[PDB]
From Swiss-Prot:
<keyword id="KW-0503">Monooxygenase</keyword>
<dbReference type="InterPro" id="IPR036396">
    <property type="entry name" value="Cyt_P450_sf"/>
</dbReference>
<comment type="pathway">
    <text>Antibiotic biosynthesis.</text>
</comment>
<protein>
    <recommendedName>
        <fullName>Cytochrome P450 monooxygenase PikC</fullName>
        <ecNumber>1.14.15.33</ecNumber>
    </recommendedName>
</protein>
<feature type="binding site">
    <location>
        <position position="81"/>
    </location>
    <ligand>
        <name>substrate</name>
    </ligand>
</feature>
<comment type="similarity">
    <text>Belongs to the cytochrome P450 family.</text>
</comment>
<keyword id="KW-0045">Antibiotic biosynthesis</keyword>
<keyword id="KW-0349">Heme</keyword>
<keyword id="KW-0560">Oxidoreductase</keyword>
<dbReference type="GO" id="GO:0016705">
    <property type="term" value="F:oxidoreductase activity, acting on paired donors, with incorporation or reduction of molecular oxygen"/>
</dbReference>
<dbReference type="InterPro" id="IPR002397">
    <property type="entry name" value="Cyt_P450_B"/>
</dbReference>
<dbReference type="GO" id="GO:0005506">
    <property type="term" value="F:iron ion binding"/>
</dbReference>
<feature type="binding site">
    <location>
        <begin position="174"/>
        <end position="178"/>
    </location>
    <ligand>
        <name>substrate</name>
    </ligand>
</feature>
<feature type="binding site">
    <location>
        <begin position="225"/>
        <end position="233"/>
    </location>
    <ligand>
        <name>substrate</name>
    </ligand>
</feature>
<dbReference type="GO" id="GO:0020037">
    <property type="term" value="F:heme binding"/>
</dbReference>
<feature type="binding site" description="axial binding residue">
    <location>
        <position position="341"/>
    </location>
    <ligand>
        <name>heme</name>
    </ligand>
</feature>
<keyword id="KW-0479">Metal-binding</keyword>
Length: 391
């Protein structure tokens, strides 16, 4: 047992040793998260990678001996929290809207938002600004909002809720933020029906209305929620976490500026080295699972620590080395198996474009604060900074 909460900001800023110390003992460990959830952690690449796809580990709450709260039960009917055949049917509804080829068509607009964002930051008569506030946050929400059909003004709200799901001002703020969001979503869905809108939310509504067995109303709400939540802090932290590593490793920042053909690889290294998903979402085994002699009971919550698999020397030689030229093949930053991130092409698209943009423009690009003054979130599921001042 370990109370990651008790560990404090020290564990949050650098949780890797802890996960590593555990990986040296066994492949699974019962811990208590900063908020207070008692779960099992799966560490070590091979085991992490295997568990992720393993059919034995279900993502359907019906298989969790720890039941959903009321607020959460309004949102669990989504592809990420289901197993086939439901997962299969639900992902097929949006699969075509997220392929590399369809996403690429968004380049002009994505490239467009970044330029504007970067032009404003540079206007800073201080040569100093927060890259989190100026680019990392604005971009993700703007892109997804236009795609689905979430009004510009309602986007702040999501910043607040998403904040609460990761770190609530109390074990209640999370549950209340879910409720508020679940109510916003439903109302927005209502406002869309019969309006002949062309945005993706409008399409999904029509589909639900065409065949409720194809997409139930509780799945229509679940779908909307998952497409807007699953990629929010994740994409935002990929960008903040990616620029930071590069900024904290000038050797690599110089490498990319000098050779832009390293872009896609450097982003892959970012995902690897400091991806925003520290631990994958809840899995619940359908039956007892002996792992190296460690048996997790059926129905227990399990978090696969992607961060620890990404620092497993065996798989990634010299894992603590941020190297934008390293063979990343195999990283699990976007997951592994049937649940592989559907938004990966778009996320990559946004990160790749914003990264280059900054490297090109920003002449004397550098961290404008001591790493020690940086603050991270305790949550073992998401790796992200509260701020990232640059100059
Ligand atoms: C840097 C950003 C991102 C990262 C690193 C990331 C990471 C992940 C991870 C690790 C999974 C699987 C989790 C598990 O198996 O427990 C996943 C699933 C998912 N992601 Fe992403 N994601 C990112 C961006 C996005 C974006 C931009 C969207 C939407 C456009 C998105 C939508 C989803 C959805 C719908 C799922 C569930 C897929 C399924 O259950 O089959 N993601 N993502
Ligand atoms: C896909 C990887 C990221 O996970 C998420 O976006 C998860 C799914 C999301 O989790 C929960 O959000 C609640 C509002 C509903 C709940 N479910 C019980 C209905 C759903 O599982 C994040 C909000 C959770 C964490 C805090 C996060 O910010 C992102 C984590 C990534 C691993």
């Amino acid at each position: 047992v370990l109370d990651l909460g008790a560990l404090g900001q020290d564990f949050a800023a650098d949780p890797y040793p802890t996960y590593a110390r555990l990986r040296a003992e066994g492949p699974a460990h019962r811990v208590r998260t900063p908020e207070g959830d008692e779960v099992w952690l799966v560490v070590g690449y091979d085991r992490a990678r295997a568990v992720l796809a393993d059919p034995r580990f279900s993502k359907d709450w019906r298989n969790s001996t720890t039941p959903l709260t009321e607020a959460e039960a309004a949102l669990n009917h989504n592809m990420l929290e289901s197993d086939p055949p439901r997962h299969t049917r639900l992902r097929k509804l949006v699969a075509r809207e997220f392929t590399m080829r369809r996403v690429e068509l968004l380049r002009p607009r994505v490239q467009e938002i970044v330029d504007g964002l970067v032009d404003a930051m540079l206007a800073a008569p201080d040569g100093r600004a927060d890259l989190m506030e100026s680019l990392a946050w604005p971009l993700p929400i703007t892109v997804i909002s236009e795609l689905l059909g979430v009004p510009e003004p309602d986007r702040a709200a999501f910043r607040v809720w998403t904040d609460a799901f990761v770190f609530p001002d109390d074990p209640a703020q999370a549950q209340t933020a879910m409720a508020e969001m679940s109510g916003y979503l439903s109302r927005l869905i209502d406002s869309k029906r019969g309006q002949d809108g062309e945005d993706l939310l409008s399409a999904l509504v029509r589909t639900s209305d065409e065949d409720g067995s194809r997409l139930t109303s509780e799945e229509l709400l679940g779908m909307a929620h998952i497409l807007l939540v699953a990629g929010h802090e994740t994409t935002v932290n990929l960008i903040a976490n990616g620029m930071y590593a590069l900024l904290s490793h000038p050797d690599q920042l110089a490498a990319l500026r000098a050779d832009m053909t390293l872009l896609d690889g450097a982003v892959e290294e970012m995902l690897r080295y400091e991806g925003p998903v520290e631990s994958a979402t809840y899995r619940f085994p359908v039956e007892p699972v002996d792992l190296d002699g460690t048996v997790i009971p059926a129905g227990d919550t399990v978090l696969v620590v992607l961060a620890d698999a990404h620092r497993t020397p065996e798989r990634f030689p010299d894992p603590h080395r941020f190297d934008i030229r390293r063979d990343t093949a195999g990283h699990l930053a976007f997951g592994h198996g049937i649940h592989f991130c559907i938004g990966a092409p778009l996320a990559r698209l946004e990160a790749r474009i914003a990264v280059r943009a900054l490297l090109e423009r920003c002449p004397d690009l550098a961290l404008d604060v001591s790493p020690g003054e940086l603050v991270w979130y305790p949550n073992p599921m998401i790796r992200g900074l509260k701020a990232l001042p640059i100059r």
